[PDB]
Write a protein that binds this ligand. Structure first.
Ligand SMILES: Nc1ncnc2c1ncn2[C@@H]1O[C@H](COP(=O)(O)OP(=O)(O)O)[C@@H](O)[C@H]1O
Lengths: 15, 264, 12, 16
């Protein structure tokens, strides 16, 4: 979790 | 047969969220384009078309999504009334921008549930639509989900029942509804026990066909709207929107889709 | 970092 | 413009 977002491109978070 | 097809003057076409919106809640620029292209071409032939749109919910939702995400913090670890506002803005934008490519002018006329109970509002709308659809102007109707609070008229008053009633009110014919399936299958399309029907007999079919299992609209409302419009005196044809050239074949004297007429 | 943790893509 | 385009595809770990 934390790590996932820690290393993600915001555009991705939109996924 | 399809003898009524050759002699229609005022045609109404309705597009649901199943066709206007594609994957990722993004306007299906493809289908939405091809169909509006063909509609502009058809209007350039002198016909009088009526457009009903249903994609406010989805586009709205996506846009709000983005706007929220743009302003969020670690939250990465919506009310329709707004979704619809933004969705309508966007849909109307696309329709216009796309229709300005063929010098076809469209005016957005929006109706609400608490408006069709008035005795003279129907007459006023009839006169204004008749006046507007004379200089090759295409009007666009859609349920105004923003102001909407909720029997009114039309069950669940989705765009299907709205289109059926509106075509029943204004003297017109050939109610065309665009879905993602190539007609009214007698059953679920996935199952092999499902065959397309050329026609529709009220007493033979309605009792025994069984179906059911898309924010705007919903099946089992389409059939009721079609039957209550056809028994009112307006022919109804159902055809898929995945091939926008289908409607041109409909309006030439060729048999595709399902029928709903006063005949038996 | 805690700052970045607390911001908006808009913020950046 | 292009800055926005990039940020969009950037990973938090790259904004440091
Ligand atoms: N009798 C049937 N024949 C074919 N398809 C059906 C039938 N009943 C339900 N469906 C499917 O159910 C779905 C419901 O969507 P529909 O209400 O038709 O469009 P929208 O949700 O845009 O109003 C349709 O996509 C359709 O394919």
């Amino acid at each position: 979790r934390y790590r996932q977002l820690v290393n993600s491109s915001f555009a991705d978070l939109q996924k």
